[PDB]
Design a protein around this nucleic acid. Structure first.
Ligand SMILES: [Mg+2]
Ligand SMILES: [Mg+2]
Ligand SMILES: [Mg+2]
Ligand SMILES: [Mg+2]
Ligand SMILES: [Mg+2]
Ligand SMILES: [Mg+2]
Ligand SMILES: [Mg+2]
Lengths: 30, 90, 67, 273, 190, 35, 819
RNA sequence: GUGUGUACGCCGGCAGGCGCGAACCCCAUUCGUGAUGGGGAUCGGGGAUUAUUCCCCAUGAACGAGGAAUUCCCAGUAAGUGCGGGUCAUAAGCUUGCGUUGAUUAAGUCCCUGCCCUUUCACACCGCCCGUCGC
């Protein structure tokens, strides 16, 4: 079963998740 | 990769390749119901051709060439926000 | 932006394109057609901008592609 | 190609990141294991820590010959133009292009469009070459070198013309993991030679200084071979490797960099074990 | 509408008396422009500079030596002043004078060269129309440049006199003498 | 550096509803309350 | 000017429906989707009728006289058409779908079976009426669906088969001794039923494979206008006990007592009925045999297979086939013309490459080496080599000399190919990829990859080589057209920037002009050598949003455009105005078995929707669809749409072709379309021409006949000239009229018995005026190719016999000369 | 081309001090074929900055296109002009970026000087490189 439509994993694979997690951490630090 | 990854394919992998959710990934839409709605009026084209079927799996190569159709009201708003509207190009 | 000559060419292009667009929008399409074809047959730069890229023999290999 | 190139870069960086993580795990397990087997002593920092081999960018080295482009910095000197002319003859199939008022990013996009494999940029100081940049264009690594003792063929009278055939490659002195990484970048600049080739190009490492030598040999008789030195002569010293292309200083990560202000930097070498 | 060079020199009355050079001198109705400054790319392909208007070719060829490199507006002003002087002195269309000068200044036969260390030996050959136009423009520009050097006379004035003398066919011009000497050398060793 | 890398993968075709973005009777009422 | 009419549908020989032979029996009528094709077997010709229908043709009823025919589609729409003049006469709508239609042998009545009932109508007359079909009678015999019809030799009575396992015989006229009669003895549906030669004895055939024979006690003359018994003589089984092979079609010739039976296994049997003797049986295909028909003379039998659309006609006695064809499974094809125009090569998604002869319209060579579908196909400068590209990743070459795939080109890297192009020289071959967006170029005789051209971004829309200059033009979706010069020492490359995405590129036949179609539905004309835009045409309004396919005419004065519209447009290039439009009909039929389509949103296809006309609204009200619990958002749905994939024009200039979704459409030159005189005057009239012939003033008569432009007049005029005066009139002919005569002569050789008389004319004209025409040769290529083709047809076939006779007789003399 | 590190006001030719919160280009003017109002080396005097660079008056050297030879260069290229930075190597007795203006000739041969290779089954075309010394 697919996840909820509001979830970001609904439209993101593991490659996008790896890059987005790094970008989120760097921006949240600032 | 090898056949190990081949055992991870499920319904979620097929759903992720649908046309409306690719728009949602590309940030052309922010909600699924809005992403679906854009499709049937014909605001979305895959290369030269315009696709109105929400059930449509787009290839990686074709994913690079999905964009707003020309002479669409949404494309006017995008150009207006960017201050790049040129009426010679219609 | 730019220099003197580039500014002059940009002004010419903007004027021509603006007139053509106005005649397309608020005037009949036919007159837009004759005016557009005249502007093209004089100088295509008046309406279509072609920027300069880097193309040179150095990228190509030695000799002809065939024979 | 803006959308396509971005996708290929992200997956390439993703695979590179996983390879680094698994290797770092091996070193922690190896260094921890050897310490207790010695049974000499347990460093306190060790206590705190405890409590696709082929490079991804070099798919196409063997199948097709590399295509090399050589350029300089803006407004080159007279002697710098001679050096770039000699490097063209060293690399088989290389081409040399005039640098006018060309933006660096504009050069890279043109090279990618025309299928150029590698891009070389050379800098100079008072008419002598001082720096060399090697970039693998399809989002490959970029290595930064400094040149020490440059001797050109133009300085030496009546040498003649070179053999210009595909040469044999000699790699010597590269033993560490970084040295294996560096020797790969230099080697893939060259095509696959013939068995009967008499041209030899040598890269010899000595205390993190790489010597470039070019030779042709002739076998007058068995067991005795005569070497005649031809081509330019110079030394190379690496100080940085970056993951991206040379159009990407502000975004690419640094795979390795030299740190000269470290307390033990003077007595340490990185290209050999 | 009618297109006139610099707003005052018509192109309809200009006619070419040489059949061979008709396809390599661009002055007619399709090549008629108001200014000799178009920002085109005429050196991109072989034979494409035959489509460049001849006034623009003269303007490009007058950007020498070195001290004049890249200064095209100055050369445009020089050409405009020279055309004004030509019209004042003669009273005819300066475009016709330029066309006649280019027609007369072009050599018809040249000599090819077979040269060794001791001596060079010599043979007569023909000249293509494109090289005729190129060499005529080069000779006229060189004559004007050498006439204006270290002399109290404007480069525009010297260019005007060079074009007037060349269109006249007189031997007082540099280009006519050079063409005559080249043709004599080609003739002598047929 | 993090801000810059976001600009590389920026999509020109991206669209948001915030991009699209009183009456005389109410305006007259406000002026009457002000006086 | 432009006088073309639709003439043939190529690539399909049979889709669905029953087959029929014409009255004389030389021609066969085959339904192909919407349209109907007639094949003249005696003269091996193919003609597609102009009519078209919204749905596939289900039934064909043919009048005994041979003048009229009735074409009924699945929905129940019927067309009355005249075979003699090939024109649609009348339109009609039956209330529901009809299963079959048959004409009485006398020609006064015809019967249609629909639902549970059989309706008999008067036969239509010659003149047009407001109501061409007038109902006569209606019969309510069976309890289930009526299937098949047959008539007696006299028109007294007729018989109908039904799905209620019984067969009903009715009297056409009121007979006291026979009202209606029912016959049983079957345990499955009736497939066919036949009558005797001159008796009321009949045969019944079941779907199970059962044959029943029924005999009556009353002769057909014994019928009395205002007491008949039937008995079962024999019962036979076609199959052995225990295998379920279903009879699907049958036919019976009354005079020769011949039965032909086709089965779902793909086999057929012959029998002689009163003794049921097996003559023999054959296996045709793995698919079922849908329809079977036999001509009047009894020598030929027609078979159709709906699974692959295979048509065969078989002459049973000498055991030879008269015709044997099978078309592409899908209408999606790629087309190329031979350099002379003699052959057409088509490629399909199945990977099958077929060569068709232009004169006959029949396929005669098939190549199957490609595994996946053929994306592109082309000819070389000679007419004997074809080059194809496919999704396999290979580009293959075939010859017409030995019929083999002698050359195969492949990329070093795994790629698939989308388009192909070859020079006029024939040495250089080029292809483009769906993904790498770069062009691969190989050498022909060497077979190795010469070069890889890179620089494009996005897919390659098309490739074309200049016919005279050997340069390559490539269109791409990066809004660029790129020109590559192959024989250049410095590798010159030119770029033409465009406002929108490029879709098509073509070259004028002279090679001096280039045309580009763009995404903004504009056609731009460029000069290639100077890289300047010479013209533009706007096409939003004409198509009713882009032009996918472009083609130049042979003379180059007009251009042909197509795309997502249902129209193909013809524009005049200099005036930049629209000359003509041709429209394309759409097929709405959908296969019932398909389950991968979401039928709820595909409601307009295949008559799925129910529209209520009795609700008091003018347009109608649609019955709502049933609901579901869970939405289906993963199934494809499609809308009715017509797209022209490509256009090609014959080098002879006689015909052109359009590859579309409906099929491969052929448009041919016809004189009846337009009257195109050259220089008329009140003096110019056929009376004066015949008077000049009577006065022996041959030159003036020929000139007047040439100003007029009926071929019949000039055909009479030239044949009036006696031999020996040929050179006299030839010298008197002016230069302008010369190329007109050669155009006439080439058309004459095809249909004239007087071979060398016209050849004497052709001999003299080329000798006297040949040197002058060389100056104007460039504008005469379509005429020259036309004349060379027609004369070659008589040359080659006559040579191999004349050479064979003369030399063999000489060898016979030499042997006899000895001793 | 932002690491907590000058806009404007007054006085003075300038160099500056005192307080406070783009060149090139284009239009016109003077000069004039004279080592000349081109050129600014050398030399004398004076003035500001915290011995150091800059500013003012004065003087006006070779140099008139650079031999024997030699090096480099094909399009936004050659050449002219300006504005920034100093990035863990090099560089400031300099290097490296970015913009602005923008050409002439040429797009093909192996003749010279060289280099890389070769001379064992579609239709059509074509029809065996030579020698020496060993074993
Ligand atoms: Mg420079
Ligand atoms: Mg420098
Ligand atoms: Mg620039
Ligand atoms: Mg001035
Ligand atoms: Mg002086
Ligand atoms: Mg002076
Ligand atoms: Mg040579």
């Amino acid at each position: 079963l697919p996840p909820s439509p509001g979830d970001t994993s609904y439209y993101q694979d593991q490659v996008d998740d790896f890059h987005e997690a790094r970008s989120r951490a760097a921006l949240a630090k600032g | 990769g090898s056949l190990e990854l081949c055992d991870f394919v499920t319904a979620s992998s097929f759903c992720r390749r649908r046309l409306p959710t690719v728009l949602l990934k590309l940030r052309m839409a922010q909600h699924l119901q809005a992403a679906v709605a854009f499709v049937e009026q014909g605001h979305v084209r895959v290369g030269p051709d315009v696709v109105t079927d929400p059930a449509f799996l787009v290839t990686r190569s074709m994913e690079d060439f999905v964009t707003w159709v020309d002479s669409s009201k949404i494309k006017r708003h995008v150009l207006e926000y960017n201050e790049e509207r040129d009426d010679f190009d219609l | 932006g730019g220099g003197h000559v580039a500014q002059i060419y940009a002004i010419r292009q903007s004027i021509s394109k603006a007139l053509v667009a106005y005649y397309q929008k608020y005037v009949d399409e036919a007159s837009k057609k004759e005016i557009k074809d005249i502007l093209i047959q004089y100088d295509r730069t008046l309406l279509v901008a072609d920027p300069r890229r880097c193309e040179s023999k150095k990228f190509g290999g030695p000799g002809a592609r065939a024979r | 190609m803006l959308r396509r190139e971005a996708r290929l870069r992200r997956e390439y960086l993703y695979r590179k990141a996983r390879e680094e993580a698994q290797r770092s795990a091996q070193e922690r397990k190896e260094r921890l294991r050897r310490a207790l087997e010695e049974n000499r002593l347990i460093p306190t920092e060790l206590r705190r820590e405890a409590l696709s081999h082929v490079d991804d960018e070099y798919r196409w080295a063997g199948v097709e010959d590399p295509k090399v482009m050589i350029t300089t910095s803006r407004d080159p000197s007279s002697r710098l133009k001679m050096f770039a002319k000699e490097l063209k003859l060293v690399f088989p199939g290389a081409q040399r292009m005039n640098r006018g008022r060309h933006e660096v990013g504009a050069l890279v996009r043109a090279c990618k469009a025309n299928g150029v494999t590698d891009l070389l940029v050379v800098h100079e100081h008072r008419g002598t070459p001082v720096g060399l940049i090697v970039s693998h264009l399809p989002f490959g690594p970029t290595a930064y070198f400094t040149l020490c003792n440059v001797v050109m063929r133009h300085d030496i009278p009546d040498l003649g013309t070179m053999s210009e055939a595909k040469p044999h490659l000699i790699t010597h002195g590269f033993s560490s993991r970084l040295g294996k990484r560096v020797s790969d970048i230099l080697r893939y600049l060259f095509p696959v030679p013939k068995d009967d080739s008499h041209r030899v190009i040598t890269f010899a490492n000595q205390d993190d200084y790489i010597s470039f030598r070019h030779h042709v040999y002739k076998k007058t008789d068995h067991r005795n071979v005569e070497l005649t030195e031809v081509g330019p002569r110079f030394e190379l010293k690496l100080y940085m490797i970056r993951l991206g292309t040379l159009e990407q200083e502000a975004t690419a990560d640094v795979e390795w960099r030299w740190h000269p202000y470290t307390n033990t930097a003077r007595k340490r070498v990185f290209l050999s074990t | 509408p009618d297109i006139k060079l610099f707003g005052k020199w018509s192109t309809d009355d200009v006619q070419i008396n040489d059949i061979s050079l008709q396809d390599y001198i661009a002055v007619k109705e399709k090549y008629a422009k108001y200014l000799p400054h178009s920002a085109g790319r005429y050196a991109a392909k072989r034979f494409r500079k035959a489509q460049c208007p001849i006034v623009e070719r003269l303007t490009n060829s007058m950007m020498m030596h070195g001290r004049n490199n890249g200064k095209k507006l100055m050369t445009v002003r020089i050409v405009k002043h020279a055309f004004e002087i030509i019209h004042l002195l003669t009273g005819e269309n300066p475009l016709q004078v330029l066309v006649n000068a280019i027609i007369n200044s072009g050599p018809r036969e040249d000599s090819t060269r077979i040269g060794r260390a001791g001596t060079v030996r010599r043979q007569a050959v023909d000249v293509s129309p494109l090289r005729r136009v190129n060499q005529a423009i080069w000779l006229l520009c060189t004559g004007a440049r050498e006439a204006a050097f270290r002399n109290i006379k404007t480069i525009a004035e010297c260019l005007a006199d060079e074009l007037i003398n060349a269109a006249k066919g007189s031997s007082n011009s540099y280009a006519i003498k050079k063409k005559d000497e080249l043709e004599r050398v080609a003739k002598s060793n047929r | 550096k993090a801000l810059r890398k976001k600009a590389l993968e920026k999509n020109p075709d991206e669209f948001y509803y915030k991009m699209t973005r009183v009456t005389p009777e109410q305006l007259k009422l406000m002026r009457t309350q002000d006086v | 000017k432009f006088a073309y009419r639709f003439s043939n549908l190529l690539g399909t020989v049979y889709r669905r429906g029953n087959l029929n032979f014409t009255c004389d029996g030389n021609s066969v009528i085959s339904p192909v989707g919407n349209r109907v094709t007639v094949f003249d077997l005696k003269n091996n010709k193919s003609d597609t009728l102009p009519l078209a229908t919204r749905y596939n043709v289900k039934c064909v009823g043919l009048s005994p006289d041979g003048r009229l025919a009735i074409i009924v589609d699945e929905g129940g729409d019927a067309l009355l058409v005249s075979l003699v003049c090939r024109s649609v006469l009348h339109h009609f709508h039956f209330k529901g779908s009809v299963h079959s239609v048959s004409f009485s042998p006398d020609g006064r009545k015809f019967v249609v079976t629909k639902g549970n009932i059989a309706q008999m109508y008067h036969a239509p007359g010659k003149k047009r009426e407001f109501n061409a079909f007038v109902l006569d009678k209606t019969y309510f015999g069976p309890y289930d669906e009526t299937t098949c019809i047959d008539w007696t030799d006299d028109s007294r009575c007729f018989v109908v088969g039904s799905k209620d396992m019984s067969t009903w015989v009715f009297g056409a006229e009121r007979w006291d001794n026979l009202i209606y009669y029912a016959l049983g003895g079957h345990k499955d549906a009736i497939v066919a039923c036949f009558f005797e030669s001159n008796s009321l004895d009949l045969y019944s055939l079941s779907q199970d494979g059962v044959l029943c024979m029924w005999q009556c006690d009353t002769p057909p003359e014994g019928l009395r206008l205002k007491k008949v018994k039937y008995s079962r003589l024999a019962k036979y089984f076609f199959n052995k006990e225990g295998d379920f092979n279903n009879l699907t079609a049958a036919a019976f010739h009354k005079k020769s007592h011949l039965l032909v039976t086709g089965f779902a296994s793909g086999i057929f049997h012959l029998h002689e009925l009163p003794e049921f003797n097996l003559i023999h049986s054959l296996s045709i295909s793995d698919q079922s045999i849908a329809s079977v028909a036999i001509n009047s003379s009894g020598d030929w039998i027609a078979f159709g297979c709906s699974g692959l659309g295979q048509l065969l006609v078989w002459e049973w006695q000498s055991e030879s086939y008269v015709l044997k064809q099978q078309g592409h499974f899908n209408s999606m094809v790629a087309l190329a013309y031979s350099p002379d125009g003699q052959y057409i090569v088509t490629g399909g998604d199945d990977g099958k490459v077929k060569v068709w002869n232009t004169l006959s319209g029949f396929c005669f060579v098939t190549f199957t080496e490609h595994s996946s579908g053929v994306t592109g196909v082309t000819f070389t400068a000679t007419g004997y080599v074809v080059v194809t590209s496919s999704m396999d990743g290979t580009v293959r070459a075939f010859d017409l000399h030995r019929y083999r795939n002698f050359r195969t080109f492949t990329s070093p890297r795994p790629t698939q190919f989308s388009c192909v192009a070859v020079d006029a020289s024939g040495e250089i071959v080029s292809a483009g990829a769906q993904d790498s967006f770069e062009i691969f170029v190989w050498s022909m005789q060497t077979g190795r990859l010469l070069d890889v051209l890179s620089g494009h971004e996005g897919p390659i829309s098309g490739l074309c080589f200049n016919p005279m200059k050997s340069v390559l033009a490539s269109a791409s979706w990066d809004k660029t057209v790129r020109l590559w010069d192959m024989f250049d020492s410095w590798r010159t490359k030119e770029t033409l920037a465009l406002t929108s995405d490029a879709l098509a590129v073509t070259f004028r036949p002279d090679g001096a002009e280039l045309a580009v179609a763009t995404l903004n539905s504009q056609i731009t004309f460029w000069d290639p050598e100077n890289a300047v835009q010479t013209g533009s045409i706007e096409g939003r309004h004409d198509l009713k949003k882009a032009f996918t396919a472009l083609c130049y005419s042979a003379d180059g004065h007009s251009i042909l455009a197509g795309g997502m519209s249902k129209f193909v447009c013809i524009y005049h290039v200099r005036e930049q105005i629209l000359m003509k439009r041709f429209e394309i009909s759409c097929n709405l039929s959908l296969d019932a078995m398909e389950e991968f389509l979401n039928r709820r949103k595909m409601t307009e296809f295949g008559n799925l929707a129910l529209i209520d006309q009795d609700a008091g609204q003018e347009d109608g009200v649609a019955i709502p669809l049933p609901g579901v619990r869970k939405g289906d958002m993963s199934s494809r749905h499609f809308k009715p749409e017509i797209r022209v994939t490509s256009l090609r024009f014959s080098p002879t200039g006689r015909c052109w072709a359009a590859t579309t979704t409906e099929g491969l459409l052929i448009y041919s030159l016809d004189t009846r379309v337009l009257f195109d005189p050259f220089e008329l005057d009140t003096s110019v009239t056929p009376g004066r021409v015949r008077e000049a012939l009577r006065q022996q003033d041959f030159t003036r008569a020929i000139l007047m006949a040439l100003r007029l432009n009926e071929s019949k007049l000039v055909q009479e005029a030239l044949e009036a000239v006696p031999r020996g005066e040929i050179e006299v009139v030839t010298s008197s002919l002016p230069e302008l009229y010369v190329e007109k005569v050669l155009e006439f002569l080439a058309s004459s050789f095809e249909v004239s018995r007087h071979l060398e008389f016209y050849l004497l004319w052709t001999h003299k004209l080329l000798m006297l005026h040949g040197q002058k025409l060389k100056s104007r040769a460039g504008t005469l290529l379509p005429v020259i190719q036309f004349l060379q083709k027609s004369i070659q047809r008589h040359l080659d076939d006559l040579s191999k016999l004349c050479s064979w006779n003369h030399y063999n007789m000489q060898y016979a003399l030499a042997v006899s000369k000895q001793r």
